[PDB]
Amino acid sequence: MKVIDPQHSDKPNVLILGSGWGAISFLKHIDTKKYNVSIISPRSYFLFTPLLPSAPVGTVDEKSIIEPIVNFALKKKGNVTYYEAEATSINPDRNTVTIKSLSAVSQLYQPENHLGLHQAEPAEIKYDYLISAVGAEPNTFGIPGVTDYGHFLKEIPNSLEIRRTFAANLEKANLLPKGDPERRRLLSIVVVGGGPTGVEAAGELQDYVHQDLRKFLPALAEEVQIHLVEALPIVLNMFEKKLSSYAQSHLENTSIKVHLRTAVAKVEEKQLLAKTKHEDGKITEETIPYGTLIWATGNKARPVITDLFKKIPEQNSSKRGLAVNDFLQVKGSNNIFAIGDNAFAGLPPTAQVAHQEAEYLAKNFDKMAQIPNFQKIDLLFEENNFKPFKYNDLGALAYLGSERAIATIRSGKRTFYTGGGLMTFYLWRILYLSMILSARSRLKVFFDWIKLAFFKRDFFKGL
């Protein structure tokens, strides 16, 4: 019950799902004069995910790396409306999306209507076109105990939980005598994932220990131990072998214990069971004690996308994400589009792919809105003549702790970069500053870093 249908305006309604890289990038490029745009997302702000790993340890403040949606919508010319709630069910036949847990409603540049909605009231939102960018969720691979004792590294709350756990453990450990094995376990951290997120997480945690903790509790600092576990035989496999090797050496020089060729079998309250697969082809078992477990491995489709597979006939055989055209239209649907991690197009699940797809699609919509036929929809994309999406891989970046990073930079064919260590660390900072989406967030992180040069990190457990 309750159906919101704003269409006194003669414009078509483009409904967006999410407030991440795909949704915001699309929002920034979509012509709000041609269409009435509306966003649905339980998250009232945009997260700059590449700096998330610096948040727990206080290299950057959590407020520094987020930006309210309304600030993006405010710079838009036309009307934009944000429903603070999550999409539960996508309804192709009805052309609606069901919502749950209404926390707020914002209607920018729309001084007129009144919805008449109580909080947590179920509803249905009409649409003419739908862009789906809810993203994925973390994958535990069905390995028991991960959700009970692990911390994912996906969202701002996760940064606060990791700080609270680790601060708690440091306080406890400090009361026990230098020998105690419990002291040793409480000071043990385990990051699962050999990719960029995991490496950066181990790097930042190590930075905090060597730089901040050592200055007022050197005793505790010496006994802390950080493990990095990865199933593949090479860390950061998306780079050339030469850069991966340097990466692995450096991590071990900064005293991080790297566990390659290693899968996790089970996760318990105080330890995890791992199977390591050696060069001679033999498998061994080892226990890894821990006090804080960061889970930074791959992705899995969300319940809303899974529920959509059952409804569209040709979307049956789909698991990783939604099956999509060369034009980023959802296969089998008349008007549903998909971008980012929640959409399969044989491309990686990365922020670079989300942004470029978002722009492409936004560009097309602004082109599509200059025709009588768009004012049935599938054949019109071709007749008028315009190009499909061509991803342009720009490369990869990764901070490795202790003022060192690796970089590969390119455009299509040619490659040009500086990807060693300290100088690449400086390039790394500049580029990241450059690709932050807002000026406020950019000044905030700049100040965080200036402050970090002179005074070192804030690491409060209650804040």
Ligand X SMILES: COC1=C(OC)C(=O)C(C/C=C(\C)CCC=C(C)C)=C(C)C1=O
- Which of 13, 342, 408, 441 is close enough to bind ligand FAD by CB under 6 A? 342
Which listed option, a second copy, ligand FAD, ligand X, none, makes contact with residue 106 (CB within 5 to 8 Å by class)? a second copy
Please report, in range form, the residues annotated as the binding site. 13-43, 187-223
How far is 301 from 49, CA to CA, in rounded Å? 18
What are the tokens at 144? 């028991």
Residue 311 burial class via C-beta count within 10 angstroms: exposed 0-12, middle 13-18, buried 19 and up: middle
* 97 binds ligand FAD, rule: CB under 6 A: no
Q: What is the CA radius of gyration of the chain?
A: 24
Q: How many residues sit close enough to a second copy to count as binding (CB under 8 A)? A: 42
What are the tokens at 41? 């997302």
Identity of the residue, 416 or 455, whose beta carbon is nearer to a second copy in the bound complex: 455
Which listed option, ligand FAD, ligand X, a second copy, none, makes contact with residue 17 (CB within 5 to 8 Å by class)? ligand FAD
Q: Within positions 352 to 411, which residues make up the interface with ligand X, using CB under 6 A?
A: 352, 355, 396-398
Three-state DSSP class for 437?
coil
* 435 binds ligand X, rule: CB under 6 A: yes
- Which of 15, 30, 31, 53 is close enough to bind ligand FAD by CB under 6 A? 53
For the chain, how many residues are written?
463
State which residue has the least CB distance to ligand X.
196
DSSP 78-99: S-EEEEEEEEEEEETTTTEEEE
Cβ atoms 335, 130 nearer than 8 A: yes
What are the tokens at 250? 């450096």
- Which of 57, 272, 330, 351 is close enough to bind ligand FAD by CB under 6 A? 351
What are the tokens at 3? 């159906």
Tokens 């009144």 identify what position? Answer: 114
- Which of 105, 168, 234, 238 is close enough to bind ligand X by CB under 6 A? 238
Please report, in range form, the residues annotated as the binding site for FAD. 13-43
* 120 binds a second copy, rule: CB under 8 A: no
* 410 binds a second copy, rule: CB under 8 A: no
Which listed option, ligand X, ligand FAD, a second copy, none, makes contact with residue 18 (CB within 5 to 8 Å by class)? ligand FAD
Identity of the residue, 78 or 340, whose beta carbon is nearer to ligand FAD in the bound complex: 340
* 86 binds ligand FAD, rule: CB under 6 A: yes
Cβ atoms 205, 151 nearer than 8 A: no
Q: Within positions 161 to 220, which residues make up the interface with a second copy, using CB under 8 A?
A: 171-172, 174-175, 177, 215-217, 219
- Which of 49, 71, 91, 402 is close enough to bind ligand FAD by CB under 6 A? 49
Binding-residue pattern over the window 52 to 81 for a second copy, x denoting contact by CB under 8 A: ---------xxx------x---x-------
> What number of CA atoms fall less than 13 Å from residue 402's CA on the CB side?
14
Strands 322-323 vs 257-259: parallel, antiparallel or unpaired: unpaired
Bridge partners of 129, per DSSP, are 14
Binding-residue pattern over the window 19 to 58 for a second copy, x denoting contact by CB under 8 A: --------------------------x-------------
Q: How far is the CB of 17 from ligand FAD (least distance, A)?
A: 5
Strands 395-399 vs 150-152: parallel, antiparallel or unpaired: unpaired
Q: How far is CA 463 from the centre of its chain?
A: 23
* 437 binds a second copy, rule: CB under 8 A: no
The DSSP letter of residue 315 is G
* 59 binds ligand FAD, rule: CB under 6 A: no
Residue of 80, 87, 122, 83 lying closest to 104 (CA atoms): 83
DSSP 150-173: EEESSSHHHHHHHHHHHHHHHHHH
Which listed range, 7-15, 92-100, 140-148, 348-356, lies at the site for ligand X (CB under 6 A)? 348-356
Cβ atoms 35, 369 nearer than 8 A: yes
Cβ atoms 38, 81 nearer than 8 A: yes
Q: How many CB atoms lie within 10 A of CB 219?
A: 11
Bridge partners of 294, per DSSP, are 151, 191
Sites of contact with ligand FAD (CB under 6 A): 17-23, 40-43, 49-50, 52-53, 86-87, 133-135, 153-154, 196-197, 302, 304, 340-342, 349-352, 354
Sites of contact with a second copy (CB under 8 A): 45, 61-63, 70, 74, 103-106, 108, 111, 114-119, 156-157, 171-172, 174-175, 177, 215-217, 219, 439-440, 443-444, 447, 450-451, 454-455, 458, 460, 462-463
